[PDB]
Design a binder for this molecule. Structure first.
Ligand code: NI
Length: 341
């Protein structure tokens, strides 16, 4: 059965609710982004209308085989009528194709569902500037002050400089980057660009990247591993064993691996600056954990919510424990008393 925080009152609509079977009363199922916890349940057998971005639509058709007649893509930043209700889709600054959804309810209430997002000041000049929001359904992944991490630009600067240094000292080093979902593509794209290489990967991952409308993608990626000195591998293989095993396969072309594991936040964020990060090393293999986040920091989240001034907040992450729910409600009240709404 579908939980309450996935239902939009006063509508026939649900958000990210495909794992509960046929939901009673649902005439349109919205999908915010192509991450498995959110699409869990969709397949080629699905026969209800799905509303989403163009990119999410390309992935539902090609990767999950949902039939074309049930895929309803909407443009961003554009007022659209769905089953008699005005909606708008906004870029969520998460993974490719990820949206926030603004719903303009027939009774005059306005609801924003963030999906998963990384709040940014640029959102203060979207179609959100124009009007009031009564209810915010908020991605609270990192809603606690201990959750700090750098900008995505600083992280990419660290990775480019690390890779370029290592390969210039040793032209026989291979760079490997882990992945397990869409998102974070800038890590491997920026490293390959500095090195003058395409990115090599499996046929399955190439297929996924080809759904994402990235400009000039044919110039940036390939299935021919041998021609490439930046390889992608599943995240589970980014360990000393997996990487040793991979270096054997390259036919004595390389004598060193430098690998990157983009994570979210990890506790080493509490003590170490991005500048000061060091790898784990065994022999000719080195592994860097880099804190590339596609979710809001606590400070970015606080800023967004204090700017929007919603009348009510409904969290969509960390909702399963009393202690989590209580902690989050405390911070929402501080924010509201500090800013005066
Ligand atoms: Ni996500």
């Amino acid at each position: 059965t579908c939980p309450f925080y996935k239902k939009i009152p006063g509508t026939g609509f649900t958000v990210d609710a495909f794992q509960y079977g046929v939901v009673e009363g649902c005439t349109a199922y919205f999908l915010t982004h192509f991450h498995s916890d959110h699409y869990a349940g969709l397949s080629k057998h699905f026969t209800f209308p799905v509303y989403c971005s163009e990119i999410t639509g390309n992935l539902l058709k090609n990767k999950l085989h949902v039939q074309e007649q049930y895929i309803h893509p909407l443009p961003l930043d554009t007022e659209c009528i769905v089953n008699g209700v005005k909606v708008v889709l906004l870029d969520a600054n998460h993974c490719p194709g990820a949206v926030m959804i603004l719903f303009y309810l027939p009774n005059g209430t306005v609801i924003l569902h963030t999906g998963d997002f990384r709040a940014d000041p640029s959102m203060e000049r979207s179609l959100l500037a124009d009007q009031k929001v009564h209810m915010l359904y908020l991605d609270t992944t990192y809603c606690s002050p201990e959750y700090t991490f750098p900008s995505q630009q600083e992280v990419i600067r660290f990775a480019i400089n690390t890779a370029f240094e290592a390969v210039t000292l040793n032209p026989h080093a291979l760079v490997v980057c882990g992945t397990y979902s869409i998102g974070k593509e800038k890590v491997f794209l920026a490293i390959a660009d500095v090195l003058g290489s395409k990115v090599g990967m499996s046929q399955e991952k190439y297929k996924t990247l080809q759904c994402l409308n990235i400009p000039e993608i044919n110039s940036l990626i390939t299935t021919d591993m041998c021609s490439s000195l930046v390889h992608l591998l599943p995240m589970m293989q980014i360990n000393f064993k997996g990487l040793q095993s991979h270096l054997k396969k390259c036919g004595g072309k390389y004598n060193q691996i430098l690998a990157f594991r983009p994570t979210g936040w990890t506790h080493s964020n509490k003590f170490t600056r991005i500048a000061d990060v060091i790898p784990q090393t065994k022999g000719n293999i080195s592994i860097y954990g880099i804190p590339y986040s596609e979710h809001s920091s606590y400070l970015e989240m606080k800023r967004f919510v204090q700017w929007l001034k919603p009348q009510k907040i409904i969290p969509t992450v960390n909702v399963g424990t009393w202690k989590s729910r209580s902690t989050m409600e405390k911070y929402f009240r501080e924010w509201k008393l500090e800013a005066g709404y």
